[PDB]
C-alpha cells in the first residue's frame, strides 16, 4: 500500500497498515515499539501469537515466548482477580495469589533478596498521576500478571514513587517501573524485552490492560 506511507507514525492506528512489512503502522499500533519481533527467528510467529495452542517454533525469548502458550495456569482466575488486586503488596501473605499468573501477591510471601532486571520500564499512561496512584495496587497487579514477573514503581531520592505528569502545557502520566525476577528462576532479562512484549500484545489485539497506554519504553 502507497497510502500507508503517509499514515506511518500519524498517532492513529490504521488496521490497513498493522503488519510487520508496514512497520506496525510506524509504531502506531504497537505502542511506539518499532519491531517487537526484532530478534525473532521464524516469521509468521506474530500470526500464531494471537492463538492459544503451543507453537514450539515461536517459543524462544526472541520470539516473545509465543504469548506464553507453551509455558502454560495461563491466566489469573477472574473470580479471584479483584481479591488479588486489592491484597497485592499489602504486607500480609495471600498464598492463593502467590503465582506468576496473579503477580506473586506483590512478593508478600517472598519477603528473598531482589533480583532486578536490566533497566527501567517506562509507561505513558493516559491518566492523571492522582488518579493512577489511587489505583496503584490494581495497576501493578495486572501488569505483574500480564508480564508474569513482579513489578513495582522506581523510587526517588526521598523514597517516593516515580510517577510524574506527562506534557506540562496541557496534560497523561509517566510511570517508571522496575522488574523483580526473584521468584522467576520463561522470564524478562531487561526492560526493553518486556516493552516489546507489551507492544506485541497491542499489535495482535491481545492487550487486556484496563489502563489506556500511549507508549511503552526501556531506558537505562
Amino acid at each position: 500500500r502507497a497510502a500507508c506511507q503517509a499514515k506511518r507514525g500519524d498517532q492513529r492506528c490504521d488496521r490497513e497498515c498493522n503488519s510487520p512489512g508496514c512497520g506496525w503502522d510506524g509504531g502506531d499500533c504497537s505502542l511506539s515499539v518499532g519491531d517487537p519481533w526484532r530478534q525473532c527467528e521464524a516469521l509468521q510467529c506474530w500470526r500464531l501469537f494471537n492463538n492459544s495452542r503451543c507453537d514450539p517454533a515461536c517459543s524462544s525469548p526472541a520470539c516473545l515466548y509465543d504469548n506464553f502458550d507453551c509455558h502454560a495456569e495461563r491466566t489469573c482466575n477472574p473470580v479471584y482477580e479483584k481479591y488479588c488486586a486489592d491484597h497485592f503488596a499489602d504486607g500480609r501473605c495471600d498464598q492463593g495469589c502467590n503465582t506468576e499468573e496473579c503477580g506473586w501477591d506483590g512478593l508478600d510471601c517472598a519477603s528473598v533478596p531482589a533480583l532486578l532486571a536490566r533497566g527501567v520500564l517506562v509507561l505513558t499512561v493516559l491518566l492523571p498521576p492522582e488518579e493512577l496512584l489511587r489505583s496503584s495496587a490494581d495497576f501493578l497487579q495486572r501488569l505483574s500478571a500480564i508480564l508474569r514477573t513482579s513489578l513495582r514503581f522506581r523510587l526517588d531520592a526521598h523514597g517516593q514513587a516515580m510517577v510524574f505528569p506527562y506534557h506540562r502545557p496541557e496534560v497523561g502520566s509517566v510511570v517508571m517501573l522496575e522488574i523483580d525476577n526473584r521468584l522467576c528462576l520463561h522470564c524478562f532479562p531487561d526492560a526493553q524485552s518486556a516493552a516489546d512484549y507489551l507492544g506485541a500484545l497491542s499489535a495482535v489485539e491481545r492487550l487486556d490492560f484496563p489502563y489506556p497506554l500511549r507508549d511503552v519504553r526501556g531506558e537505562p
Partner: antibody, heavy 119, light 108 residues
C-alpha cells in the same frame, strides 16, 4: 480552557453545497486529531470524518467518502467540513470534537450547528 | 464494518434504581469502548473511556465494565438528572462507530 466553536449551517437547497467551520482554542492544535460527528433530528450520533492538524492526514466513514471534504488552517486553529450533493437525509446537528491521544475518545465537543436541506 | 448494538433501545426506571445498559460489538474490540451521556438539545458528555475508566467530574454511580464484545454501563442509583440518551463508541480504529442509543426515562 479548551474551546470548540462551530460556524456555518442553516438553510441549503437540495443538491447544493455547504461548508462548516470549527474554531479551536485553549490547547496545542497540532497535538490532537479533530473529528466531525452528525446527529439527525430524533436519531442517534454518527461519526463523519477526522483530520490530523499535524500531518494533514484524513480518515472517513465510507458513507461520506467522495461527497464530503475535510480541511484545516493551522494559523487560524480551525477545521472545516465541506458538504456537497446535499440530500434531505443530511439534515442534522453537526458537532466538532477533539480526539484524545491514540484511542480517539471525545472529552471536548463543540456546541453543534443545525444544517437544514430544504427547497 | 464493526457494528455496535445497544440494549434496550428505551428504559423506564425510578429514582434509586440500579440501571443496566449493554453495548455489544459484532467483532472483538478489547478495551476500546467509551460511554457518553446526551441531554436534549445539548452536546454529548463523556462518562467512561477505555471500557472502565470514569472521566473527571463524573459521579461515582456511573460504572463501565467488559472486554471483547459484551460491555455494560451501570448507574447504581438513578437520579432525576440521569434522564438522557446514552451512547457507546468503538475506539482506537476508524470508523469510530457509535451505538444506537439508550433513552432512560424516569418513573415518578
Amino acid at each position: 480552557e479548551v474551546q470548540l466553536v462551530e460556524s456555518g449551517g442553516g438553510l441549503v437547497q437540495p443538491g447544493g453545497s455547504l461548508r462548516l467551520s470549527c474554531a479551536a482554542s485553549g490547547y496545542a492544535f497540532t497535538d490532537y486529531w479533530m473529528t466531525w460527528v452528525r446527529q439527525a433530528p430524533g436519531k442517534g450520533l454518527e461519526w463523519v470524518a477526522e483530520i490530523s492538524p499535524n500531518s494533514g492526514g484524513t480518515n472517513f466513514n465510507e458513507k461520506f467518502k467522495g461527497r464530503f471534504t475535510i480541511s484545516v488552517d493551522n494559523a487560524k486553529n480551525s477545521l472545516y467540513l465541506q458538504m456537497n450533493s446535499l440530500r434531505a437525509e443530511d439534515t442534522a446537528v453537526y458537532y466538532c470534537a477533539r480526539g484524545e491521544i491514540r484511542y480517539n475518545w471525545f472529552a471536548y465537543w463543540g456546541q453543534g450547528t443545525l444544517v437544514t436541506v430544504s427547497s | 464494518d464493526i457494528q455496535m448494538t445497544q440494549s434496550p433501545s428505551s428504559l423506564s426506571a425510578s429514582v434509586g434504581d440500579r440501571v443496566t445498559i449493554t453495548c455489544k460489538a459484532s467483532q472483538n474490540v478489547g478495551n476500546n469502548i467509551a460511554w457518553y451521556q446526551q441531554k436534549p438539545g445539548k452536546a454529548p458528555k463523556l462518562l467512561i473511556y477505555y471500557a472502565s475508566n470514569r472521566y473527571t467530574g463524573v459521579p461515582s454511580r456511573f460504572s463501565g465494565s467488559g472486554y471483547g464484545t459484551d460491555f455494560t454501563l451501570t448507574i447504581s442509583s438513578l437520579q432525576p438528572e440521569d434522564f438522557a440518551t446514552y451512547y457507546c463508541q468503538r475506539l482506537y480504529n476508524s470508523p469510530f462507530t457509535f451505538g444506537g442509543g439508550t433513552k432512560v426515562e424516569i418513573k415518578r
